[PDB]
Amino acid sequence: ELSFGARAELPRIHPVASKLLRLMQKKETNLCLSADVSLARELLQLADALGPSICMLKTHVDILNDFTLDVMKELITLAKCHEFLIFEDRKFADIGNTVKKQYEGGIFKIASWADLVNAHVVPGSGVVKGLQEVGLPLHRGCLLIAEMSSTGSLATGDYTRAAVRMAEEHSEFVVGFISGSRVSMKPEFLHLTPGVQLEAGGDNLGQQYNSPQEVIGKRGSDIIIVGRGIISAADRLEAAEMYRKAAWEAYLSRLG
Amino acid sequence: ELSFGARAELPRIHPVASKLLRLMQKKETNLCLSADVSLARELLQLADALGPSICMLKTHVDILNDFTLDVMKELITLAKCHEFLIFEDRKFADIGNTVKKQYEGGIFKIASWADLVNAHVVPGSGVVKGLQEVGLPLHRGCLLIAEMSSTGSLATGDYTRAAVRMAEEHSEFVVGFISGSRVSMKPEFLHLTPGVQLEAGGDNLGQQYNSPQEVIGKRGSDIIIVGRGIISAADRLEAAEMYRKAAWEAYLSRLG
Ligand SMILES: O=C(O)c1cc(=O)[nH]c(=O)n1[C@@H]1O[C@H](COP(=O)(O)O)[C@@H](O)[C@H]1O
Numbered sequence: 487e488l489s490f491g492a493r494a495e496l497p498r499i500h501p502v503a504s505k506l507l508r509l510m511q512k513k514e515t516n517l518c519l520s521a522d523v524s525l526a527r528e529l530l531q532l533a534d535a536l537g538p539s540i541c542m543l544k545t546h547v548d549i550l551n552d553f554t555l556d557v558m559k560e561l562i563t564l565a566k567c568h569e570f571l572i573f574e575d576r577k578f579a580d581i582g583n584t585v586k587k588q589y590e591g592g593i594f595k596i597a598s599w600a601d602l603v604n605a606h607v608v609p610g611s612g613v614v615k616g617l618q619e620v621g622l623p624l625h626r627g628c629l630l631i632a633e634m635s636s637t638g639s640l641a642t643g644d645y646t647r648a649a650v651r652m653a654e655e656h657s658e659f660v661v662g663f664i665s666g667s668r669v670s671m672k673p674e675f676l677h678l679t680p681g682v683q684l685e686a687g688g689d690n691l692g693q694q695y696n697s698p699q700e701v702i703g704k705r706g707s708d709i710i711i712v713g714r715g716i717i718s719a720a721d722r723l724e725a726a727e728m729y730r731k732a733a734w735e736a737y738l739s740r741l742g
Numbered sequence: 743e744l745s746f747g748a749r750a751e752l753p754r755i756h757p758v759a760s761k762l763l764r765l766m767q768k769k770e771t772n773l774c775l776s777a778d779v780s781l782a783r784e785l786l787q788l789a790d791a792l793g794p795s796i797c798m799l800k801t802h803v804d805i806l807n808d809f810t811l812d813v814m815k816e817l818i819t820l821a822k823c824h825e826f827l828i829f830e831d832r833k834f835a836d837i838g839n840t841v842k843k844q845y846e847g848g849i850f851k852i853a854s855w856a857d858l859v860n861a862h863v864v865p866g867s868g869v870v871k872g873l874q875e876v877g878l879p880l881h882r883g884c885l886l887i888a889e890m891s892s893t894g895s896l897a898t899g900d901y902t903r904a905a906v907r908m909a910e911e912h913s914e915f916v917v918g919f920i921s922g923s924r925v926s927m928k929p930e931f932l933h934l935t936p937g938v939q940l941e942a943g944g945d946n947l948g949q950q951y952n953s954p955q956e957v958i959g960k961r962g963s964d965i966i967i968v969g970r971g972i973i974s975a976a977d978r979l980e981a982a983e984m985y986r987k988a989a990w991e992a993y994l995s996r997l998g
């Protein structure tokens with residue numbers, strides 16, 4: 487097993503993955519903030535205050551009540567300042583011809599500001615081919631959703647294996663996975679795991695939580711994605727630091 | 743086998759399904775226009791000219807370069823005038839807590855103007871439970887994606903069966919399917935089929951086409967969804983009439 491810093495230098499590493507792995511090592515963070523807020527001002531205040539603690543800020547641009555492209559310019563300024571990637575959790579899941587337009591165009595122009603997006607594999611590899619025709623020229627990366635945190639997820643067994651094959655066949659654009667665990671044996675790929683809180687529990691709409699120690703240390707994932715465990719806390723900076731220290735120590739203890 | 747008009751009266755029919763089935767019977771159309779355009783003016787000019795020929799207009803609001811809620815108000819005026827439903831093909835595919843926000847909020851406020859939306863079943867039934875919390879109070883309906891038209895689709899076998907079970911267990915909100923065929927034996931559910939053109943072929947990003955006679959007549963679906971077969975034609979009105987007459991006669995000949 488290699489450190490994040492050594493994985494950043496692997497021969498087959500994608501440039502976006504390399505940039506991420508280098509800043510994870512530099513800052514001692516494998517925490518992705520899930521910035522699940524509706525106000526631009528709260529998004530930007532969280533990005534500024536928590537920027538030093540995170541490797542990545544995950545957005546749902548389509549729940550922002552006051553989205554503008556100027557908000558995303560301000561988020562990029564903070565991402566450059568504090569050194570984190572922007573990941574739009576859009577979960578592209580349509581035919582290739584449609585997702586290319588959803589990624590490049592419309593109001594959001596996601597490809598113009600998102601370092602990373604993700605896609606479901608259920609439509610077949612056309613979803614990746616469509617995205618990559620916008621994303622490759624714009625030097626972007628993509629994550630494939632191999633496993634899901636929610637109750638009743640059908641992303642198991644042969645489905646998860648299909649996601650890994652699709653990733654490993656589109657390595658010029660696909661840099662890793664949304665997963666609950668290590669699903670690829672190839673160290674070039676990133677594993678990002680949502681459904682994370684320090685305490686046992688869930689929500690009322692099928693979310694299930696596991697701890698950073700479980701998902702990073704026992705299940706072998708790289709990055710924790712944390713929304714409400716941070717966002718709903720009074721002191722979101724201290725909460726981010728608790729999640730960062732948990733995920734980072736779990737990573738170190740697997741390295742030996 | 744019952745006519746659309748008789749299905750509109752079934753005891754367990756959803757009000758949105760009933761409204762749709764009644765206008766399908768009245769207008770002799772089981773054509774859904776896939777209005778895959780980037781300009782509001784072209785969307786509205788197609789909705790006005792083709793409105794009499796269609797039971798439904800399917801949108802991808804996120805590819806409209808000049809989206810505003812006022813555009814949606816003008817589309818509703820045309821939907822009411824010509825009698826068709828509005829279906830936003832958003833393919834919700836996240837945890838329940840997230841999709842509720844994506845459906846009600848952000849800049850699109852999809853639930854405010856869309857009669858119908860759709861969802862992938864891969865996250866488990868929480869996706870439906872989250873949507874239905876917004877959609878039930880707003881008197882909306884949902885379609886579940888049981889089969890996909892694209893090459894390499896994983897929506898087959900047990901996945902398709904899981905989509906049908908999820909629909910039949912959430913019948914207060916789920917009114918039917920995106921599918922390539924009849925997948926439910928319950929006549930209360932609508933089957934809408936994309937990947938339709940009069941000529942054999944596909945696109946360069948995994949889209950596969952079948953004819954209206956094949957999907958309505960042989961595969962037993964209710965509604966054809968047609969994008970480029972109409973939108974790329976010079977005369978979109980005559981193209982819509984060709985598709986309407988094809989789908990309607992295929993339906994009649996299955997009835998006897
Ligand atoms: O792609 C995602 O990040 C995602 C995948 C998944 O399997 N589960 C999941 O919860 N998510 C997202 O990650 C976040 C989880 O948020 P919390 O439950 O608040 O920590 C939400 O924004 C979800 O939309």
Ligand SMILES: O=c1ccn([C@@H]2O[C@H](COP(=O)(O)O)[C@@H](O)[C@H]2O)c(=O)[nH]1
Binds near residue numbers: 831936967
């Ligand atoms: O299985 C599916 C589901 C949706 N769709 C959508 O239907 C439309 C098909 O358009 P087309 O006729 O131009 O190929 C397009 O908007 C797709 O996003 C499919 O093509 N297949």
